[PDB]
Every structure is written in C-alpha cells, then in structure tokens.
C-alpha cells in the first residue's frame, strides 16, 4: 500500500542528505589526440569513485580544405557532429544512454534553457562576449585553409545537479564503467553538394578534398565524494540509484503527404522529452513541409495539435530561440509520457511534402527502472 | 480570520488540480479575411474544464501600392496587428479589456524577455530565427508585399502554476466571448508626420498601403480531467473567484516641470504598470522626462527615479529596454490603496508637445465580489 | 384553472428580473464586404443571460456608373438593404423569419413613428438631422456615389418591459443563429418599368449601378446578472416559453370588386397585420382599392373601411402614413386568435387589378413553444 | 431593517395624498426689462408658499447688428444661451441646481421627449404651427437689422408633475429662497468668425458690432397650495422633501486620439442623465471626431460601448431627433448610475481627432440626500 509512499519519502531524504553532506568534484579522466583516419572509436574508463553524475567531454579538431578552388560551409548541426555516437555502461554493464552527438547536444541545450554553453550577444560596452570560444567552428573553410573547432557535450547519468535520479554508484573495485565515444572521420564529416548533411560538419563543393588533421578529447568526470554514512552504512537514495536516465534515438520511415505519421511511444518508459528531426530526403526545412505536429493518446484525442510556427513558439519559451531547420522539440518533463497511465500515446507529424528517402529521426529522453 | 483556512485550502486544491488534471492546448477557430470588409470578430471558446488562456496567432500580408515611396515599421510594428481585445466569461463578467500593444508588453514582462523572441548567440550550431515566430519586414518598398506574423497570449490564469484568474467553463452552457478587433487600412499605416502609436508601418508611401489579407487562429489552453473528491470537484475557490485582468486608459493635462499624477483605484491589487508618453506623436527615449515615480499621499515617493535609472530597473526584468514606453513591476507587493488614490503613478515631464498624453496599462487582481 | 397562478407567478418573476438584472447592449460582430462575392451571413450571438433583441446597423456605398442617367430611391429605399432575416434560438426553434422591409415597418409601428427618424420642428436651437441615423440620398446622379445608413431591430422580447418572446441563452453552449441576407447588385436596382418592391433605387441608370461595398455591425441587447432565489434563477416561465415572431407571406388571385381573403392560422395570437398591394409593380395610394377589412366567418366585418379611413386609423398609430400601397392593422390589445383555422381573415376588395398582382402579408404574433 | 421599506411606503402615500388634495398654481413672481450692458445678474426672490415644484422663466431680447456689411448667424445653441447660468438656493440656503442655460435647456428637452416647447411640423391644412413663437430666434441678423428672440427655461425642484422628489417646502416666513439668473451680454452673445461659439447666441463676420438693445425676463413660480392636513399637521412626503434633484455641469480636459477619456462619476449621487459636449477646440462635429462613447464600471466592462451613430440612435428614441452637433446624451433614469451599488463608473469617450484646447463639457442630472 503506502509502502512506496514511504519509499519515495526515504529516497528524497537520502538524496537531500547526500547533496548536503558530500562535496561535488569534477576531474579529468583521460585526454587523447589522434587522427580519425587512424582510429575513431575510443573506450574511456571512468574512475570508480562515489556517486557519478555525468561526464563533460571537451572535443577539439583541426580540419583542412585542400580543394583547389571550392569552399565548404557548416551544416546546420556543424560541430555537434564531431561525436557521432556515445554509449555508457555502468559497473553492472547495464547500458544507460546510447545516442548521437547531435541528439545529446540538443538535450544539453533543452536542459540549459538556451543554446548549450553559448555566449549571448548584448549591448554591453564592457568586453564580455565570445572570449574563450568554448563551442566554436568557422562558418566556412576556404580552399587551402585550415579551421579549428571546439565542442562540448555533457553525458548525463544523474538528471540534474539536484535530482540524482539516474546517477551511478561506483565504489565497487574491479568492476569498471565504460564510456564509448565514436568520433567523426573524413567519411562522415564532409558532405558533397546535394548529399544529405545530417551527420556532417561541413558541406560544399570542396568536400571531397577535406580532411581532419586531428581530433582531441578530454573527458571530465563529475561526481560526489565523501558520501554521508549513518546507521546502516552509506545514506543513499535507493530509487534514484536504481533508475536509469537515458537518451536514445531511432529512425522511422513511411511518410506520405497529408497523412498522419504516428510514432508510438515504446511503453513503460517515462518520456521526459521528444525530439523529431524531419530529414526530408536530405532536405531540412523550416516547417514549410509540415501541416502540423502533435502528441495523441489512444482516443485520437490530441493534447497539442499545432501548426509548425505555433509548435516552434512553445519551443522558443523553452530555449529562447529555435532549434535548427527541421528539428522539433517537445517538453514533457513535469508530466512524462507514460503509457499504462493513459493508453498508448504517439508523436504525430502530418507532412505537407514528402521527398524520396524521407524519414523522422526520433530522439528520446526518459526514465526507466533498472534490472 | 478564517482566511488562513480559506487560503490554505485554496492552495491545496490548486496543487491537486495541477497534479491531477492534464493540460491541453487546442485550436478553437481560424479565419482569413480582408480588413476592408470587416475587422471585428467575436470568438467563442469551448466550455471545457478550467480555462487558462488563449494563444492568438495572427498573420498578414501588406502591400505597398505606392508608386515610388516605401514605409518602415513603427516602434510597435506587428504588435499593432490586433488593436484591442476583450474577454467575457460565462457569467458575463469581463476580465481583460486592453490594447494589443499593452497585451504584448505584458506578455514580454511575464516572459522576462521580448515575447517569443529568438535570442542571438555565438553558437556555431544553427539555432536562431529559423521559424520566424513573431516577424515583420523592417520596410516594405514601393510595389512590394510583406508577410507578418504576430502572437498574443490572452491570460485568464496568472501563470502555468498560479491559477488565480482562471475560469471554470465545464460549468453552464452560457458562452464565453473573446472579442478581437484587428488593424485595418485606416489604423495600420501612418503618413510621415502623423502619430505612429497605433500603426504598423509609417512612411511616404503609407496612403497607398493596404492589407492583402489577415488571418488568425485562436488556440485555447485549459486543464481537463479535473480531480473529484467527496463533495465533488476539488477546486481552488479563491483562484476561480478572482479576476486577473489587463486594462488600459488615457490621461492628458501634462505641463513642463509639473508632477502629472495618475491615481490608482482602490480594491484592485496592481501587479504592474505601463505608461507610454505619447508626446504629441513623438516618442522619445527619456529625454522629455525629468523623472517618474510611484507616490503615496502623505508619505512621498517610493521610487522617484531619473529615466535612465528607471530603465535600469526594467532591464533587470526583461533583459532589454521597452521609446517612450515605461514599465513598473509591483508583483511581489501589489499597489493596493483601500482608499481611491492613496497611491499614484507620477511623471514629471521636461518637454510637453501639443496633444501630449500618457497611455496607461495595468495588470491587476480583484475579487469577483 | 391554475393558469391564474402561473400568470401571476410569471409576471412577478418578470418584474424581479427587470428590477434586479442590468441591461447591456454589446457589439457582437462587424463585417465589410462586396455583394458581388457574398450577401448571406450567419451571425453567432453571445450566449449570455436573457437576450432581448439585436440592433443591426448597415452602411453602404452605391455607385451609379451609368454614363448619363440617374436613379432615385424607391418607396422602401434603404429599408431594402437587408432582404431577409431569420433567427434560430439555442433549441433550434425559429422565431422571426421575414423581409427587411416588413421588419422595418414593424419597428416603426412599435415606436409609434418612422423608426429612428428625426422629427422636424420650429426650434431655433439646432436639433435636427444631425447624425443621419437612417439616411439615403434621394437620387444618385450618373457617375456619383451615395452613402446610406439603415438600422433594424430584430426583436426576441416584445418590448423593454414585456419579456414575452425573450430567449434564455446563459443556457447550453448550443449556438444561436441570426441569419442576414443583404441586398446585392441584382436586387438593389430596378430599371424603369420594373417592379421596385425589393429595390433600393430605380431609374434609367439602374443597369449600371453597383455596390462599392456594404458593412454591418450587430449589437446584442440582453439582461445580465439574473436574480437568483431558493430554487435558483427567478425566471418568467411563460415569457421564456412563448415565441414573439414576425413572418411574411405572399398571396395572389385578386379580381376587381371581389373580396380577396387571406385567412389567419389558428394557435397564433396576431398582434399586427401588414398588407402590401403590389399591383403588378405599381404601388398606389389607395386608389386601386374599394375597401379593406378583418372578418370572422358568420359574424361579418369588424372594421370594413374605405382606404382613407383605414389610413386614418394608422395615422393614430404612427403619426403619418406608411408608403404607397402599404396597409397596417393594429390588433395589439385584442390579438386575432381563431382557435379554428381561418375563423378570421384579412380582406382586400380591389378596385383595379393589374397583371401579376399580389398581396404581400406581414405578421407579428405570439405562440407557445408547445 | 424594514424601517426604510416602511419609510418609502409612507413617503409615497404622503406624496399621493398631497397631489390629490392640494391644487397646483403657477403665478408670476417678478418681471424686469434691462440692458445687459448695465446689469446682467439678477437675484429673484420666490414667494414662500406651499410646496414649490419649479420655475418657468420667460426670456425675450432684441439684438441689433450694426456692422456696416456683414451678418451673423445663430450658433448651434442660439437662444438657449440667453441665460448663461442659473443657481437656486432653498430657504435653508442649501444649493440645488447650478448649471448653464444650455445644459438646463437640453434637460428640459430630454424630459419632454422632444425639443422643449417646440412646434412640430405636420401636413395639417388647419393653421396650427408656429403661431405664438414661444421659443424663437431669427436664423440670421443682417447688417443694420434688429432681431427679436424668445426663450423659455424650466428650473426644476421637483423631478416631475407626479414625482415630488426634490420639491421644496417653503412655508417658513423670514427665510427666503434665491433664484439667481446670470444673463448673456455683448461679450458672451456674439462670436467672431473662428472664435468658439459654445456660449454665444450669434456668430459671424458682423459680430464685433452686434449689441443687445434689451433683455426682459418674467419668472413664474409653480407650486402646490392648500396642503392636506391630518393627525400630526401637514401630510408631507418626507423623503421627497429632503432629497435634492439637481443639475450641474463641469469641464474636463486631457483628450488624446484613440485613447479612452474617462470621466468618473463623483459617487454617492444617483445620476439620472449625463450630457457630454465635445467642444473640440471650438469645433463641434457630428460624431466624426469620435470612435465610440460608453459607460463603464470598475471591471472595464462596458454596458453600452457604441459608435456615434448608434449612440445617436438611442437618443433619437428619447427625444425624437438628435441634439446639436457634438452634444451627446445618456438616459439612466430607470437605473441611475450609483457608485457603491457597483463600483466606480465612468462616462467614456474615445476621440478619433483632438484639436488644440479640446475638452468635454459634462452635464449631470442627479438625486442626492439633503444635509
């Protein structure tokens, strides 16, 4: 009965005590510089200490355009595509997040409430601004030039700094975690004119002759040390630590003009957010190829059937700007989509135009029970 | 004072409603028309659950048919696509009755930044003004047609978490009335030298500008699946018996270097005040004002400030400025006189042109009594 | 007869409502359009309190594009800016369904003078036709554009003090329907020699006249803040369950010197009757009629009168004469109520009958929703 | 509790008895002929007899235009401006009405339901018509001509012939009433071209050379004699006689285009009617300088927000014609505006055009308690 109500209360209290008694630490775990032509997949081994909240991954790169005459220009995702995929496994080898660099980056932005680690432009005469180039990439790389890029990703375990749901307790020696990073290479980073720019960093007539010179990464692990001890050992939020907070993405196809394309939510998960990217056969449009988007439950009842601009309006309230062309976001944080609470639910897109090889790339943020 | 009990209960009921019901935003009406034929519409909301507000989307195409002269956006621009709004609840009681520009400025004050705007940053990832949510061409050249988009949020409930002012509409069949008066060919275009206050574009080609058409879509935001208990629906009775309204007014009689005082009425709890100094058609960036203030009779000013310092307080609220438009936040401690005029809004003008006046805008709470 | 009790209660409730509620007149809709594209509109009233009626303001600009010929107002003139009106209440029941000119004539009969007119007096103080409330140019010359203004009151309640026929609309969400059909380029202009009955202007330049545009604004009059008692809303149940409607009809088959009888139906309590003698497009000042009357089968006529004497009774009601060929009959104090269909008829014995002659009838009546 | 309900009933009964038992009388109180160049203010002393209902004031005048060539023409108010102001004080020196001749005249018209004491034009062949020139003034007075004018004003104490609310009991010897009449003179009666015609009788290029030759007035007092006596002396409607029925006017400025100009009702009074004159800097327009007019209560809720022609339509139902240009009327007789019954109320005018020196001249008709 009220056995869980007491469980919930115990969890929250334990969380509050851990946060107040422990001290946060962020420390470098590993750094490596390489040429992706040699190797692009790396398995980083996080340190086993206290409760792990997440990882901040710094990625830098140098790209050279050796085309004789043509330039290349940033794609809509640009440096967010420096990391193609990220996968994390905890000490019990349970997989948490497994998604694309672009999806992880869009969630980082959604959680910040503004473009992740960006520098806002103001009229201040004091010289604040893009001083440190935290996330940066040249808009174009001309024939014969070399550009430098910097990108950051936050790989979460814990939901936030104050909500430890999804965090990982790593104090078991001989049982390691694994943070796998799959980086871009010359094949994924450069798209020829007319090719699909989805996974690319630069696109243009000089693409065939573009090459990475090097990529470097530094992984910083954020955790809580000096865990509080009481009468039974460590005071720990048991629900928090046995819940997985994950990001995952998938691709759905089968769109036809003026027909509702419905992507069912894969039940049992508590979906906090949904990102839908309309890759219209390599074309990414600013809503003009969509009639409306919606979230619908078993009853054909729509809770937010909106035209594209109005849908975008809701997103502007969340991140203070629009996501790139063809990228749509839906916040369900306060009331996560959870089938079994109200029948099957689906994310809906009714397309106005559908090109060949059209598809919806879905990105989800969700909570689910461990084991 | 059984009030503590009433408030304690009200707040608990509000939380149960927010926790148990499910939010819905739904289109209730769309229409396209030519301002030459009509510009006043009465939208009928759906009578379902607890209504929180209405999101009104307005799009328009404006053609500058002048032979050689262009026009440029006024300071309010697309915010003048809707001239006025009035809302009547199922009990025939009015809530908001104000201008489109005042409604828009409150939307901005409540968001803490220009309403539904896209902030500019150094991000290399292509975030930005991708969807043109609120948009209008800076100028429309002779012979050109410009496309505009504007959004307004007409609030009933104070916010997503504070249901004060919300309307229970699952109640009687009696209809709600959301009245909208749109800009027309007579209000949208101002000739050079004319007052641009209510206009969208001003310039030498104004006389030959016209609307090709205007379209609006109203979305209703409400809470459905209301929680039921012993006695029935669990409802925040104080929230639902309180009105959260925006209203505007105009005052004249300004004289150089003399305090011009606009009295606040009693009974109303004023959350914010906006004062626009329409200096005879000229809108200046504080240079025509000595100071502004809020004053209580026999207790002097609580914030007599020069225009720039007054603007500084506003920058803390909306991250920018908001020419001639002044804002005052009294949300944490609402102006509440108890005696008519115990408190007034003050403007001591430096220069006063012919036909000068202050256009006031208010946000307030008041009991249905 | 528990009726006395019902009526006694109804009347008391009416008085409480009038005493306790507050009257409101509010704009519900405005629209400007070109008759070439559309002329029929369905206005949706607000569902609030007890609705008494609608004030409809209509303005129009008419351009005579003819090269050299003018046109002049017909006898009905701006009263034909609205061709027809129909009102449906929240329960899908129709009340008034009649022509704009009949509605206007009833508005006049109820006011006791030409509706919303400005009376002329010797006052040196400048009262007069200052605001042009109902107005239209007597003629529109070739190449000219005239501006017109017309007002109509569509009643639900019988009057400001008698709520019989009023509609309770705070009730269900079900919508009311106020349907309006406006004049268009095909009905507003009559060529010389053509029937001017439904037209606004007639003349040699008619074929080249057209509307520049028409605009309307509907104002809804209702009572808000309805009084509540023990059982709840204090309401006049008889008033609200009775329909007060205006309706029109057309009858033909007239023959010189023969009584032409238009039977009244049973069930309806007829408050007034209007009969227009459209004598094949000609409208005469009584010279084509021998007499008019109201007759009950097997009890003869209750008012068989020559046209001038019939007109004299009307002068006592509206302080002037209705236009040529338009005849009015007031039965407000003792409504025509047959109980048997046709026990009573309206009579016109014509002196001269032209081709295509007919009587256009207009009625004001009360009837239970049953 | 029901102490007032019994008071109301007692009052009405007393009123009914007074009306049925007493006999109405109207008798001349004073007549005087003068040149306003000599004196224009007169304090008339009404006779102290019975219950006084009001005064009918007959005013005649002769005006000469001695300009060498130019004429003058009647202003919109014309002879209604022969009396500039009227003020009445009762035997206790309590002031009742204090207003302008034009406002008093407009109320006389509103109460009659037609232009006050006018002669209606009809097709009657019998010679009814303007036979007696009760209220009359030549439309123009040519250079070198003399015109004759006649004007009548009813100064009310009692509300009507059947409602004695506001009447005055004057049976106290040694305590007199005062009816002060302030007449027009050469300065107020003639306006030059381009000057404000508000208070003037004639305006035109010959104005500077116009002069009154004389003005004459005759005041008739209307009262009830032979007051009924019962068991306690005079049977008198105590509420009626202790209530003031007054007319007053004021000027409000501060109008700006497209902004609601609100004139708050000065609470506690029961306002029966409101007249608003839009003196647009000396220009008086037929509604074209106004967007709408309204009466609004604390709630921004309008009970009759109407465009000018529709507002005029309501007035045509009341006086069978329109008031002069720029004059707007509002009837609240059956449900008087009374703050404290429904929050503050205001009369509203939203102007379309506002000239220099624009203002609203407000005229009120109201009931208020004595003492």
UniProtKB/Swiss-Prot annotation, chain C:
GO terms for cellular component: viral capsid. InterPro entries: Phage_PRD1_P3, Phage_PRD1_P3_N, Viral_coat, VP_dsDNA_II. The keyword tRNA processing does not apply. Its main location: virion. It is found in: Virion. Homotrimer. This is Major capsid protein P3. The gene is III.
């Amino acid at each position: 009965a009220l056995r869980n109500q007491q469980a919930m209360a115990a969890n929250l209290q334990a969380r509050q005590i851990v946060l107040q008694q422990s001290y946060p630490v962020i420390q470098q775990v590993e750094t490596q510089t390489f040429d992706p032509a040699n190797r692009s997949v790396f398995d980083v081994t996080p340190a086993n200490v206290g409760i792990v909240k997440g990882f901040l991954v710094k990625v830098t790169a140098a790209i050279t355009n050796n085309h004789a005459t043509e330039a290349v220009a940033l794609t809509d995702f640009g440096p967010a595509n420096l990391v193609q995929r990220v996968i994390y496994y905890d000490p019990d080898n349970q997989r948490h997040t497994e998604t694309s660099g672009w999806h992880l980056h869009f969630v980082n932005t959604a959680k910040q409430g503004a473009p992740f680690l960006s520098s806002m432009v103001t009229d201040s005469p004091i010289k604040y601004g893009d001083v440190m180039n935290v996330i940066d990439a040249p808009a174009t790389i001309a024939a014969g030039a070399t550009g430098e890029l910097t990108m950051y990703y936050w790989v979460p375990l814990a939901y936030s700094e104050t909500d430890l749901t999804g965090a990982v307790l790593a104090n078991v020696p001989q049982s390691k975690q694994r943070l796998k990073l799959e980086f871009a290479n010359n094949n994924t980073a450069f798209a020829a004119v007319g090719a699909n720019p989805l996974e690319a960093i630069y696109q243009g007539a000089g693409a065939a002759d573009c090459e990475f010179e090097e990529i470097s990464y530094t992984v910083y692990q954020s955790y809580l040390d000096q865990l509080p001890v009481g009468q039974n050992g460590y005071i720990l939020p048991l629900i928090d630590l046995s819940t997985l907070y994950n990001l995952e993405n998938s691709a759905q196809a089968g769109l036809t003009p003026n027909v509702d394309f419905v992507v069912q939510y894969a039940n049992l998960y508590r979906y906090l957010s949904t990102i839908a990217v309309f890759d219209n056969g390599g074309s990414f449009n600013a809503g003009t190829d969509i009639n409306y988007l919606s979230q619908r439950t078993a009853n054909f009842s729509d809770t937010r059937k909106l035209d594209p601009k109005t849908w975008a309006a809701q997103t502007r309230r969340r991140i203070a700007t629009d996501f790139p062309k063809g990228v749509y976001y839906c916040d369900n944080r306060d009331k996560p989509i959870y089938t079994l609470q109200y029948g099957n639910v689906g994310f809906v897109v009714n397309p106005k135009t559908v090109n060949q090889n059209a598809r919806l790339l879905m990105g989800y943020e969700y909570f689910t029970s461990r084991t």
